[PDB]
C-alpha cells in the first residue's frame, strides 16, 4: 500500500528552471488526491480532458508530475495550445493534453532582496519545443550569418537568462511555482488508481 | 577547464580606491555566477559579492555602500571596486564561481572554482 | 545576516582518529550548508554541499549531517592530507556567512 510521492513535489524546498523542468515518475501506488482536493482561492488550478471529481474514480498507466519556476505574466502559456517565450523554448503543453495544472505565488520563497538569479529560463532557440521536450543545451545561439564557435559576440548570445526575482517586483514579475500533472493511459496495465 | 586568475594593486594607499580583476579562461561565461571573497589575516572567509551574466548583484550588505562589481563578457573578465579603503581592507582576495548545475538545479550556490588569490595591503 | 558557529575552533588528532566538527546556524538553514577544506597557503575547496552530498573526488571517509539549525561534518578515519582547516558555509539567505573555521592539527 504505497501512497503516490504528492508531497515531495508540491512541499519540495528547491524547484527547477523552467528550462531544465525536472519530472517524477509516479505509478504503481495509492493517489491521495487532497493536494488537488480541495485547493484554495489562491492557487490557479486548470483541468484539461479530465475532471478532477473522477481523477479518484480512474486508474492510469502513468502519472507524469512537472514541477519548474516561471514568473506570474507567464502561467497563462503553461496550458494547451500556447505561443510564448515559456511554451516554445521551455516548457510545452501538447493540443490533446490530459491532466491540470497547478500555480501558487512563491515571493515568499524564490526572492530575495538583492535578486534571486539562480531561476534561469530559454530565450532563444532556433526552432519551437514539441510536446514534453526539456532542452539543457547551453550552446552559443547563432543569431546571424558567421559561425559563432563558442564565442560570445554580435549576433551570437548565450541562450539562457535570469530572472532577477526581487520582492519589491510587481505581481507579473513574482515567482510562481508550477506542477503540472500528467495522466497517461496507454496499452498498459493501470497502477495509478485512486482511494 | 574554467580558471581564474586575479589582477590589481598589491598596495594600496588609505582612502583610495582598490581595483581588483579576475580573468576567466577556458568556459562560457554565461554558466556561471561570478563572486568575490575576502580572507583578512587571522579571519575565516568573508563572502563580498555575487553577479551573474544578466546584470544582477547582490552585495554583503556591511560592504554594499563601498562595492561595486562589472562584467566585461567581450575581455573575459569581471572587476570589483572597493571605495574608501582602510586598513580592514587588508586581506587576499579570491575570485570564484559556482557551478553549472544541470540537474541539481542552475547556480548551485557552490564554489567549486576558485582563483589562486591576490594579497592586497592598504597602507602609506 | 546569519550568525554561523563551528565547535571546536581547533582540535589535535592522530591518524586514523574519527574527527566531528558541529555547525550551528543562528537560524534555520533548512540544508543550504557547504563544508570547505583549506590547506596551509591554499584556497578552499568544497567537501560537502547540501549539508550531506560529497562533491566528485571527495573520500567516502568525508560525511556531512544535519538540517534546520544543527549540522555536522565527520571524518571516519584521519589521513595526513586531511590536516586542514574547514569551514562550513550557510547559502539559504544572503549575506552569505561562514563559519570561524576548525583547524584540524
Known amino acids: 500500500t504505497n501512497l503516490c510521492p504528492f508531497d515531495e513535489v508540491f512541499n519540495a524546498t528547491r524547484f527547477a528552471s523552467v528550462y531544465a523542468w525536472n519530472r517524477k515518475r509516479i505509478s504503481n501506488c495509492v493517489a491521495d488526491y487532497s493536494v488537488l482536493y480541495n485547493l484554495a482561492p489562491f492557487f490557479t488550478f486548470k483541468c484539461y480532458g479530465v475532471s478532477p471529481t473522477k481523477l479518484n474514480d480512474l486508474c492510469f498507466t502513468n502519472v507524469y508530475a512537472d514541477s519548474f519556476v516561471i514568473r506570474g505574466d507567464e502561467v497563462r502559456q503553461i496550458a494547451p495550445g500556447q505561443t510564448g517565450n515559456i511554451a516554445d523554448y521551455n516548457y510545452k503543453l501538447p493540443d490533446d493534453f490530459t491532466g491540470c495544472v497547478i500555480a501558487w505565488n512563491s515571493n515568499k520563497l524564490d526572492s530575495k532582496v538583492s535578486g534571486n538569479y539562480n531561476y534561469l529560463y530559454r530565450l532563444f532557440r532556433k526552432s519551437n519545443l514539441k510536446p514534453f521536450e526539456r532542452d539543457i543545451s547551453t550552446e552559443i545561439y547563432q543569431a546571424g550569418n558567421k559561425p559563432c564557435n563558442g564565442v560570445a559576440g554580435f549576433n551570437c548570445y548565450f541562450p539562457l537568462r535570469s530572472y532577477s526575482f526581487r520582492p519589491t517586483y510587481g505581481v507579473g514579475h513574482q515567482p510562481y511555482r508550477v506542477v503540472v500533472l500528467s495522466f497517461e493511459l496507454l496499452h498498459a496495465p493501470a497502477t495509478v488508481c485512486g482511494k | 577547464e574554467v580558471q581564474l586568475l586575479e589582477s590589481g594593486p598589491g598596495l594600496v594607499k588609505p582612502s583610495e580606491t582598490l581595483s581588483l580583476t579576475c580573468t576567466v579562461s577556458g568556459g562560457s561565461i554565461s554558466r556561471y555566477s561570478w563572486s568575490w571573497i575576502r580572507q583578512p589575516a587571522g579571519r575565516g572567509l568573508e563572502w563580498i559579492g555575487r553577479?551573474?551574466?544578466?546584470?544582477?548583484?547582490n552585495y554583503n550588505p556591511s560592504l554594499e555602500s563601498r562595492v561595486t562589481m562589472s562584467l566585461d563578457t567581450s575581455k573575459k573578465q569581471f572587476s570589483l571596486k572597493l571605495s574608501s579603503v582602510t586598513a580592514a581592507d587588508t586581506a587576499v582576495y579570491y575570485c570564484a564561481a559556482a557551478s553549472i548545475d544541470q540537474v541539481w538545479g542552475t547556480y548551485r550556490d557552490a564554489f567549486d572554482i576558485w582563483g589562486q588569490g591576490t594579497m592586497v595591503t592598504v597602507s602609506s | 545576516a546569519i550568525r554561523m558557529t563551528q565547535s571546536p575552533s581547533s582540535l589535535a588528532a592522530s591518524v586514523g582518529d574519527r574527527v566531528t566538527i558541529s555547525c550551528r546556524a543562528g537560524?534555520?538553514?533548512?540544508?543550504?550548508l557547504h563544508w570547505y577544506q583549506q590547506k596551509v597557503g591554499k584556497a578552499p575547496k568544497l567537501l560537502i554541499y547540501?549539508?550531506?552530498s560529497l562533491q566528485s573526488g571527495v573520500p567516502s571517509r568525508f560525511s556531512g549531517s544535519g538540517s534546520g539549525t544543527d549540522f555536522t561534518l565527520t571524518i571516519s578515519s584521519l589521513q595526513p592530507e586531511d590536516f586542514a582547516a574547514y569551514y562550513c558555509?550557510?547559502?539559504?539567505?544572503?549575506?552569505?556567512?561562514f563559519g570561524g573555521g576548525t583547524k584540524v592539527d
Open positions: 547540501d549539508a550531506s
Open positions: 558555509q550557510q547559502s539559504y539567505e544572503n549575506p552569505l556567512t
Open positions: 537560524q534555520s538553514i533548512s540544508s543550504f
Open positions: 553577479m551573474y551574466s544578466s546584470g544582477g548583484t
